[PDB]
Design a binder for this molecule. Structure first.
Ligand code: 1YN
Ligand code: HEM
Length: 488
């Protein structure tokens, strides 16, 4: 009867909290501590609506013992994405997840001042010039999946059925490796190095937000996975240092080697660079492999859209008389089917759905008397707004064409926007703004252009998969496959 005992107190307390006209409204739930982890972790945009139809734009909900004050729409964007440091912490929300996976010292295992420069150091491999050297590497890597991978084998076969839960994560990590990390880190993925990243993934799971370490196999296998992979990168670092092979514009390992001394002259360690390398590779590999998976599916549901984005690239190549191997970075900038498709795929399917900070001193919510106390979490969600009749009409319609017809601030890593209020914020905003956006459109952009150029495909049933949210990012439920045929 320690069933009534918690029930009666958590129940009676749930009503207690109703009183305070200074605390945002809270969603009801029957389980103590567990809260709405059910309804939210399964379909959270419905859940958001199922709360806005009741409470408007501002509200809260329990989540595995932790409070999550929400704020929808461009006003929520300003409230969380642009909070300054003395009220919200982005590390105190993302720490227990990313750190055990990437390693100490970097990303969220350091103060914000540190993180700001790591994002600056990174950006030295993310320039207009880098992207020109990456396009053909990324492309040729793709084509090498098309010819050597059992899902395609385009030099033997002419029709097939490729799983996008396999093709895209492998193509994504292979193209990221080959371009960001260079040829030896890519050649070393022949080995089931991949198995080590599989071991690292299975411990990069939302459950880390509460259970980041406990004595289980995939926990210790993740710990060991991070140790083996950093030391691999720590080995590439040492081997190109002592070789004198540090080329300040080529890879991201280079660029990180050069620039990795802080404002106060303090020096990132060899492992700290390796960990940050791990985070970068893993973060970008998830969010990019997802987006290419979806725009592969959606183009298979509306195969007309492969033909738009196809004819666009042959008009450019016919002006160059130069085949696909002569399709450059600046040519990506002139193919708006590709970019709007990616832009649309990111509207319909932003990879992160919730975005947290934790509250570090009481924070007054604007035009309310609600104050978030030290202890609760804030949650923006550019995703809700990405698929609301409020901000886009026919959010259901995968419409790449819909994309036709404030100055700046620099927190540390180059100039970003001061404006956060756009309904469309796939890459976030503020000091935690993403730095791989333009890079992602070079990847997704070459994946996409290469696929369409060689492959025409459909998806059987014209049923686009339902989305899953068990995981760190949002992915199609399998069987998520594509029925393809060589174009020639
Ligand atoms: C398991 C039981 C089941 C019933 N259930 N019950 C509840 N839930 C649930 C709850 C919460 C969540 N999540 C979803 C994921 N979410 C989340 C994911 C990523 C994230 O990322 C923010 C930061 C840290 O990681 C990166 C991701 N990234 C950004 N750009 C590219 N990747 C990041 C930033 C920088 C670097 Cl270097 C790497 C990375 Cl990974 O940004 C924040 C929140 C938290 C809530 C999912 C399911 C369930 O599945
Ligand atoms: C389509 C692909 C991507 C999407 C949709 C995406 C999304 C996001 C979002 C929403 C944030 C803000 C998180 C917050 O404010 O809480 C963010 C930040 C970030 N992203 Fe991306 N990202 C993508 C690609 C990448 C890639 C390829 C990389 C690395 C090469 C990367 C690295 C980062 C980093 C380092 C941050 C900084 C977070 C911080 O400063 O705290 N992202 N991203």
């Amino acid at each position: 009867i320690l069933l009534g005992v918690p029930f009666v107190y958590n129940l009676v307390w749930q009503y207690l909290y109703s009183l305070r006209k200074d605390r945002a409204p809270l969603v009801f739930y029957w389980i103590p501590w567990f809260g709405s982890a059910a309804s939210y972790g399964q379909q959270p945009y419905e859940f958001f609506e199922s709360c806005r139809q009741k409470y408007g734009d501002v509200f809260s909900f329990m989540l595995l013992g932790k409070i999550m004050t929400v704020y929808l729409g461009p006003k929520g964007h300003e409230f969380v994405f642009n909070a300054k440091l003395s009220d919200v912490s982005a590390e105190d929300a993302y720490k227990h997840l990313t750190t055990p996976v990437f390693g100490k010292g970097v990303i969220y295992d350091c103060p914000n001042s540190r993180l700001m420069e790591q994002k600056k150091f990174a950006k030295f491999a993310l320039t207009t010039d880098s992207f020109k050297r990456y396009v053909p590497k990324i492309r040729e890597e793709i084509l090498n999946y098309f010819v050597t991978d059992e899902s395609f084998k385009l030099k033997e076969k002419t029709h097939g059925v490729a799983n996008v839960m396999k093709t895209q994560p492998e193509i994504t990590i292979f193209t990221a490796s080959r371009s960001l990390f260079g040829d030896e880190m890519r050649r070393i993925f022949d080995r089931s190095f991949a198995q080590l990243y599989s071991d690292l993934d299975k411990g990069f799971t939302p459950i880390n937000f509460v259970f980041p370490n406990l004595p289980l196999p995939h926990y210790w296998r993740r710990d060991a996975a991070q140790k083996k992979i950093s030391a691999t990168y720590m080995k590439e670092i040492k081997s190109r240092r002592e070789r004198g092979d540090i080329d300040p514009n080529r890879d991201l390992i280079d660029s990180l080697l050069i620039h990795s001394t802080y404002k106060d002259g303090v020096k990132m360690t060899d492992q700290e660079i390796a960990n940050l390398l791990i985070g970068i590779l893993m973060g970008g590999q998830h969010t990019s492999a997802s987006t290419s998976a979806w725009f592969l599916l959606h183009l298979g549901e509306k195969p007309h859209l492969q033909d738009v984005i196809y004819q666009e690239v042959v008009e450019l190549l016919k002006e160059k008389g130069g085949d696909l191997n002569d399709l450059t970075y600046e040519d990506l900038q002139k193919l708006p089917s590709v970019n709007n498709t990616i832009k649309e795929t990111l509207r319909m399917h932003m990879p992160l759905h919730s975005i947290f900070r934790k509250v570090t001193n009481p924070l007054r919510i604007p035009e309310t008397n609600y104050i978030v106390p030290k202890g609760h979490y804030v949650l923006v969600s550019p995703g809700y707004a990405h698929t609301s009749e409020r901000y886009f009409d026919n959010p259901e319609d995968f419409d790449p064409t819909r994309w036709d017809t404030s100055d700046e601030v620099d927190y540390g890593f180059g100039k970003v926007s001061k404006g956060v209020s756009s309904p469309y914020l796939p890459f976030g905003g503020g000091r935690h703004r993403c730095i791989g956006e333009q890079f992602a459109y070079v990847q997704l952009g070459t994946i996409l252009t290469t696929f369409v150029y060689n492959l025409r495909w459909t998806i059987d049933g014209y049923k686009v998969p339902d989305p899953d949210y068990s995981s760190m990012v949002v992915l199609p439920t399998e069987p998520a496959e594509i029925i393809w045929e060589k174009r020639e």
